[model samples]
Target: MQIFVKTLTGKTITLEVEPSDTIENVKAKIQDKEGIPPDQQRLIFAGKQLEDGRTLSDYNIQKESTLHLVLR
Candidate 1:
């Protein structure tokens, strides 16, 4: 699946991921693309925080879905 992350700063980045991918991995990618520290990043999907304790598919994040990024 491809995840779309839109930052409040108006930056957008797409990440290719799998069901088994961890939120930490995704945060690392976001960090790579935007320089936002993974720990400072708070990923949101459907208005809920996507935490590192779960897998991508565990959150039901679909292909082409949008995930908002907020700095903590």
Candidate 2:
């Protein structure tokens, strides 16, 4: 599935994700792509924090689901 992440600067980073992948998995990929530490990355979906304890599917993230990625 495709994920859309928007940063503070109004930049969007597109990513492909699998249902079985966790937030940590995505965060790691984001860290590689954006140079933001996985721990420092905050993922927000549907106005709530996307937790590491859950998989992407747990949040029902599908194609083009917009996730706000903020760096701490």
Candidate 3:
């Protein structure tokens, strides 16, 4: 599945991922695309902050879901 990530700068990043993917996994993908470290990345979806240990499905994140990314 694919997901969308909206950056603080308004750039939308597209990532190919799985429902089983953890927030840490998503952060790593963002790091690959934007050179931002995982620890510095904050992800929010459906108005809830994502945690590294949690999987996408844990938050009910489906395909094409859009997440907000903030840099710490």
Candidate 4:
């Protein structure tokens, strides 16, 4: 599935991911693309914070879903 990670400054990052991938994995991918470490990344979807240990499927994320990315 594909997801969009949008930043506070209005930049969007598109990532191809699997439902089985953990939130941490998504953060890692963001780090690779944006040079921001996972520890400094916070992902929010549907108004809830995504936990690192949780899978995308756990949150019922669908294709083309958008996640808000905030830096800590």
Candidate 5:
């Protein structure tokens, strides 16, 4: 599967993913793409902090879906 990441600044990135990946996996992806540390990567969705170990489906997030991130 694949997913899209859009930042508040209107930047976007698309990444390949697996069905079993978590938000933590997305965080790592963000860190990898943006060259930031995982701890320093603050990604939020729907006004909530995206914590570690949260599987994509746990939040009803779908594969190949576009996810918005308010990176802080």
Candidate 6:
């Protein structure tokens, strides 16, 4: 699936990922594009830390869906 991440700074990046990809992996992708450290990052999906071990679908993240990045 393709994931779209939009940072608060108004930058966007897309990543090709698999179901096996972890939240941390996605976070890393956000980090790669946003240059934000993991410790300073937080994820909110449908307004929910995106709990540690769940599939992207669990977070309501769909293929090519755009996710808003709220950096802390």
* The best candidate in terms of lDDT: 4
List TM-score per model, in order: 0.90, 0.92, 0.96, 0.96, 0.73, 0.74
Top-down TM-score ranking = 4, 3, 2, 1, 6, 5
How far is 33's C-alpha from truth in model 2 (Å)?
1.1
By TM-score, the better pick of 1 and 4 is 4
Model 5 alpha-carbon drift over 4 Å, by segment? 44-49
lDDT of 2 by residue, 1-72 (tens): 888899988999998889899999999889888888888889999988999879989988888898998888
Q: Please report how far candidate 3 places residue 36 from its true position, in Å.
A: 0.9
Q: For residues 1-72, what per-residue lDDT tens digits would candidate 4 score against the true structure?
A: 899999998899999999999999999999998899889898999999999999999999989999999999
Model 6 clashing-pair count: 0
Show the lowest summed lDDT stretch of 10 residues, model 4: 33-42
| Regions more than 4 Å wrong, model 4 | none
Candidate 5 lDDT score at position 22: 82
Q: Candidate 5 has what TM-score? A: 0.73
TM-score of 3: 0.96
TM-score head-to-head 4 vs 5, winner: 4
lDDT score, candidate 3: 0.93
Residues 5-72, candidate 5: write the lDDT tens digits.
77777888887877578878778887888875777666655556666787776666666677777645
- lDDT of every predicted structure (CA atoms): 0.88, 0.89, 0.93, 0.94, 0.72, 0.73
Decide which is better by lDDT, 4 or 5: 4
Model 3 bad stretches (over 4 Å): none
Instruction: Judging by lDDT, tell me the better candidate of 3 and 4.
Output: 4
Candidate 6 C-alpha lDDT tens digits along 1-72: 887776777777787877677788788776786678877777666667575577676676778777666777
Indicate the TM-score of model 1: 0.90
